[PDB]
Amino acid sequence: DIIIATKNGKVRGMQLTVFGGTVTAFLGIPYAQPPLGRLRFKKPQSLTKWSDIWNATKYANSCCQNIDQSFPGFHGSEMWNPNTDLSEDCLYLNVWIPAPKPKNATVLIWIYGGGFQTGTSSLHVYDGKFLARVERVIVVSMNYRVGALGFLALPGNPEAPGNMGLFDQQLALQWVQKNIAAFGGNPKSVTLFGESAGAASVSLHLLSPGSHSLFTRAILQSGSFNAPWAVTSLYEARNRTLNLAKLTGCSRENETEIIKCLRNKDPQEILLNEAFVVPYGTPLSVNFGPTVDGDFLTDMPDILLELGQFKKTQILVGVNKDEGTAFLVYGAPGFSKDNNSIITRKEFQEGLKIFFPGVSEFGKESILFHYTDWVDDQRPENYREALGDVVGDYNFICPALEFTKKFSEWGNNAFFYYFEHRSSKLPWPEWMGVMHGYEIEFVFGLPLERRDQYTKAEEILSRSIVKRWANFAKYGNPQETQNQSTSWPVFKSTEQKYLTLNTESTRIMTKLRAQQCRFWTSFFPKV
Amino acid sequence: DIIIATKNGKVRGMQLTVFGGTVTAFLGIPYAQPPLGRLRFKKPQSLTKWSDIWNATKYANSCCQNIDQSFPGFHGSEMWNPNTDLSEDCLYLNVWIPAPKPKNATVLIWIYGGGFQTGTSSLHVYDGKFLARVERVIVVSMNYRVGALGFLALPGNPEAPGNMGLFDQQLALQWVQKNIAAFGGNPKSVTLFGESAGAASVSLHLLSPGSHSLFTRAILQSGSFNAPWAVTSLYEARNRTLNLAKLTGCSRENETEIIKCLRNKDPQEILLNEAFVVPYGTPLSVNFGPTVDGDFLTDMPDILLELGQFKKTQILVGVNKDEGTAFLVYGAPGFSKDNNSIITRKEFQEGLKIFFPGVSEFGKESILFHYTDWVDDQRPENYREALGDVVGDYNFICPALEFTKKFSEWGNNAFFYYFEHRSSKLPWPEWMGVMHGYEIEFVFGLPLERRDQYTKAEEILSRSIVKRWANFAKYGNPQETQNQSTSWPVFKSTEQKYLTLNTESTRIMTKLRAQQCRFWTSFFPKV
Numbered sequence A, B: 001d002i003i004i005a006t007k008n009g010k011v012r013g014m015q016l017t018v019f020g021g022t023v024t025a026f027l028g029i030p031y032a033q034p035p036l037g038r039l040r041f042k043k044p045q046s047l048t049k050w051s052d053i054w055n056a057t058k059y060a061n062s063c064c065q066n067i068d069q070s071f072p073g074f075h076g077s078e079m080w081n082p083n084t085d086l087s088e089d090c091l092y093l094n095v096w097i098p099a100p101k102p103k104n105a106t107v108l109i110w111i112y113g114g115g116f117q118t119g120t121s122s123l124h125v126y127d128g129k130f131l132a133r134v135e136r137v138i139v140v141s142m143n144y145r146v147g148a149l150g151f152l153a154l155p156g157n158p159e160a161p162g163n164m165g166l167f168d169q170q171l172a173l174q175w176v177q178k179n180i181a182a183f184g185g186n187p188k189s190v191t192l193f194g195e196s197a198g199a200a201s202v203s204l205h206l207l208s209p210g211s212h213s214l215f216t217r218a219i220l221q222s223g224s225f226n227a228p229w230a231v232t233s234l235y236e237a238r239n240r241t242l243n244l245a246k247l248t249g250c251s252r253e254n255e256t257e258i259i260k261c262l263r264n265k266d267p268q269e270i271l272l273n274e275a276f277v278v279p280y281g282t283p284l285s286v287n288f289g290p291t292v293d294g295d296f297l298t299d300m301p302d303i304l305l306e307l308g309q310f311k312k313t314q315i316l317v318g319v320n321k322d323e324g325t326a327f328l329v330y331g332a333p334g335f336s337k338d339n340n341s342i343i344t345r346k347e348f349q350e351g352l353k354i355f356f357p358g359v360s361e362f363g364k365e366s367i368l369f370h371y372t373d374w375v376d377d378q379r380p381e382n383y384r385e386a387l388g389d390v391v392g393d394y395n396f397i398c399p400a401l402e403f404t405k406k407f408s409e410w411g412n413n414a415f416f417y418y419f420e421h422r423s424s425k426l427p428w429p430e431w432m433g434v435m436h437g438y439e440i441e442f443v444f445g446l447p448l449e450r451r452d453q454y455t456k457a458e459e460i461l462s463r464s465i466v467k468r469w470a471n472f473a474k475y476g477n478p479q480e481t482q483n484q485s486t487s488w489p490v491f492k493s494t495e496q497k498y499l500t501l502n503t504e505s506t507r508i509m510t511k512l513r514a515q516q517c518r519f520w521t522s523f524f525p526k527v
């Protein structure tokens, strides 16, 4: 029976057996007033406090969200769907601590991705028990609001100010500051890590004055706020809020009246209308996401990045070799997870329409030109691979690299990785390669479980990643020092060294995607 | 009818059609008195001179040599066997010039490998017509004596002083100095290139005072004189000469008498006994090779290299990804070109005996230890791959890298490549990978011939190699400047950048085989 006294009252955890040892799991601790009724669309409000013992022995409700129904029965898509009841009552967090209770352990705080429209902390591939067991760190993860319920913005209006889910994340960091010592944690040694939209969140906490003292350092897996899906302009955000009102029958003259009406809608009516607030979407559409609110974010984030206005600390940043491929089967013509998807030039052309719907003809021809100068054989997979690379380079890899250059130009140490191992168990087909999201199970140490059908080479690779992430969190330096590992150099503009993560041999390389990123970073923005 | 006046008289060439253009080929020009009778075992003597027109319209006799009979009927071994009559009358050379006759063309001089026991300039994969056609350089190649006829040594005795075949090569360089302008060549812009023993020859011309003014720069493909097969000690050389005498019935008291007797033997009796002058050989045995003769080589070559005593000029050096694999099927137990050669630990152990016959038990256990710490899966091909790597790293790759560090420490520009493309047509099986010798057909531009069943990607790769070798010869800098190619950095000790040559993407990498070469270079020599 393990009971911890928190600031707001007692909580009871549960003991788990993990690799011949024990971890204590406190699952579903609340960290804010449930955001219901008059609190829908508002900043999270602080927790009242309880007497008696709160039982943190099961995962809580996931936040309301639309679900992926493109591949019913298929584990490759379905593993990302929520595995707890959906509810507006979802502001809870999880804590995994080593047993015996540690004395002053580093804390790793996970922020899930999902486009800021989806996601939940309770997914199997984010289970923190393995990290707590093996590295003796404490792992924390939180649910935060997503979609319109988390990001609806009528900027400047506190009834719906925008960025509510980012404030949810913030309030959970504050909970760790006030409470984690009771669990044997060091509030002075907190590292945020997150993937995709979770990585873009981590990058925005580096920018938010109110987050600066709530953590020590940051890890960004395939995401950063300068990615083109990551931040909505004030103009598109007001437009979206108003389109949502049109569709739900809540157009009014007074803006506060609009929100009042929106608070009477059932969550379903709101979720059903989210896809249509926009005239054309792509598979990467973020209809309701971070905005410049004058509160969480004081100015356009590209300006803060460029002018050095962010927390000074070390970062670890990385991407997967085939980021863009998972998205091609959610609308590009000629793609299928169930065949080899050899597409024509005409199909490639139509795919650019799917992925770059607002872009001029010239803009799209410039993409085709940069990506279809073949080298040179008449390989049939040319157009299929080019489309995946287009989508991965624009959306993930070039923004990650550019975030990393700009951040390290102000004097701090940065480490960059390129993940290139395809899981032996991936249910998606082979042409999709080393997909977006499929490093996460390596970072959380799932292949450390022998029962679990990963190869030996994969266990060893995961074990080494876990040690490098942990050494980064504790010490600021992602080395694996005992096993003659390749030493991981800092990423500097100029040399731009990065480390490859793979099962065969780990390499130091330079200037990842140099020709492609010159295209996306210096030319495409002008288009 | 194309007739050139040389210093020793007129020669007639023949015209070839090559890619819609013409090349003039002068094949089989003599460059020394045939080394027969009282000239066997002596330095080549200068050519008398002829009247009338010498017809250089066919390849000449190849030098006497033993032939590879391990795989009769198999193109993978047989393509390296001589394709002209063998004869002691073999000191001839070939010249390919562009048509029309160039005005002051750079000259590339090819020196073949074969262990200093075999080889010939007339092989199909050394045909210089493609280079002359496409890069407008002049290509020269020579036959030089091999085996005891080329390298028998009773050091200090001019009847058999040693290094005769290296002096054959030298006398051919002198011929190019005196004669190449008549063919439209620039004697001031000569580059030597060679592979394996040919590459070790090129490295020894960098060291020989008498070669310094006979060429401008050097290209070393998988070979350098510090390789452990490349130079015989005085002690083993005298011992070998005397063992040869025992076996042929030529033991005498006076050494000059020994040689006189040796000159009465039929070449066959000499060739038949060469394999046995040594108590145990390996597949890389060089029974009769370069020695320190006080003439060509004034001191131990490792001393000259270390103390900076060599020609100051740029070099281009490289190796193939699987150098050692071709040798495993000439005696390692459990190997076959006709199956996958999965070998046990015990077979690996016996293989070390085949390849390191004079080495202590400790020496061999130290190899097993360095190479069998698996990473980590229980992959069945572990021992098979380890043996190939042992043999390639010791014999080729680490010596090439160490030659390259030491040479560039004295101020000259060096370029290093790692060739990693396996020919689509290789007749050897797949486990042998990117074999020793199979870059040569890329350097000579054979895949430029469309008729010839190479892929498109291979044509393009060869075209780019040919341009980089030609730019190196003409300009000292192996860049391909027109097609946005990866810029090839100079190799410096400290960074040790090298360039990978492959069909997919060309990369700049650092510190090739760093852990393995530390083993072979700093520890193994002590053993």
Ligand SMILES: *[C@@H]1O[C@H](CO)[C@@H](O[C@@H]2O[C@H](CO)[C@@H](O)[C@H](O)[C@H]2NC(C)=O)[C@H](O)[C@H]1NC(C)=O
Pocket (backbone or CB within 6 Å): A332, A333, A334, A335, A336, A338, A339, A340, A341, A342
């Ligand atoms: C692989 O599967 C895809 C997905 O269906 C096939 O794409 C269809 O091809 C047809 C022609 O029969 C188009 O008119 C359809 O509209 C495509 N369907 C969809 C739903 O996009 C594709 O042709 C297949 N490719 C293969 C077998 O190489």
Ligand SMILES: *[C@@H]1O[C@H](CO)[C@@H](O[C@@H]2O[C@H](CO)[C@@H](O)[C@H](O)[C@H]2NC(C)=O)[C@H](O)[C@H]1NC(C)=O
Pocket (backbone or CB within 6 Å): B332, B333, B334, B335, B336, B338, B339, B340, B341, B342
């Ligand atoms: C592949 O072929 C080799 C070459 O023969 C096989 O090696 C022989 O294996 C036997 C046992 O039958 C040894 O006793 C022989 O002496 C080996 N022969 C020689 C000539 O070396 C090898 O076993 C085969 N490996 C396979 C099929 O995986």
Ligand SMILES: *[C@@H]1O[C@H](CO)[C@@H](O)[C@H](O)[C@H]1NC(C)=O
Pocket (backbone or CB within 6 Å): A103, A104, A186, A188, A189
């Ligand atoms: C934990 O470590 C910090 C410094 O990182 C120290 O100031 C703090 O008081 C420690 N607390 C313990 C050991 O309880």
Ligand SMILES: *[C@@H]1O[C@H](CO)[C@@H](O)[C@H](O)[C@H]1NC(C)=O
Pocket (backbone or CB within 6 Å): A463, A464, A467, A480, A482, A483
């Ligand atoms: C270090 O190597 C050993 C095997 O030699 C292994 O058991 C262990 O997991 C490795 N540790 C890390 C952190 O990679």
Ligand SMILES: *[C@@H]1O[C@H](CO)[C@@H](O)[C@H](O)[C@H]1NC(C)=O
Pocket (backbone or CB within 6 Å): B103, B104, B186, B188, B189
């Ligand atoms: C060829 O070039 C050299 C310098 O590299 C020059 O000295 C020589 O005389 C030239 N000969 C010609 C154009 O015939």
Ligand SMILES: *[C@@H]1O[C@H](CO)[C@@H](O)[C@H](O)[C@H]1NC(C)=O
Pocket (backbone or CB within 6 Å): B463, B464, B467, B480, B482, B483
């Ligand atoms: C340069 O590229 C073109 C194709 O765009 C090709 O025809 C040519 O062979 C290339 N040249 C070299 C030297 O690689």
Ligand SMILES: [Ca+2]
Pocket (backbone or CB within 6 Å): A423, A425, A426, A427, A441
């Ligand atoms: Ca999986």
Ligand SMILES: [Ca+2]
Pocket (backbone or CB within 6 Å): B423, B425, B426, B427, B441
């Ligand atoms: Ca071949």
Ligand SMILES: [Cl-]
Pocket (backbone or CB within 6 Å): none
């Ligand atoms: Cl077109």
Ligand SMILES: [Cl-]
Pocket (backbone or CB within 6 Å): A510, A511, B508
């Ligand atoms: Cl670089």
Ligand SMILES: [Cl-]
Pocket (backbone or CB within 6 Å): none
């Ligand atoms: Cl053993």
Ligand SMILES: [Cl-]
Pocket (backbone or CB within 6 Å): A508, B510, B511
């Ligand atoms: Cl390095």
Ligand SMILES: [K+]
Pocket (backbone or CB within 6 Å): A366, A523
């Ligand atoms: K452009």
Ligand code: NA
Pocket (backbone or CB within 6 Å): A072, A073, A078
């Ligand atoms: Na479902």
Ligand code: NA
Pocket (backbone or CB within 6 Å): B072, B073, B078
């Ligand atoms: Na034959």
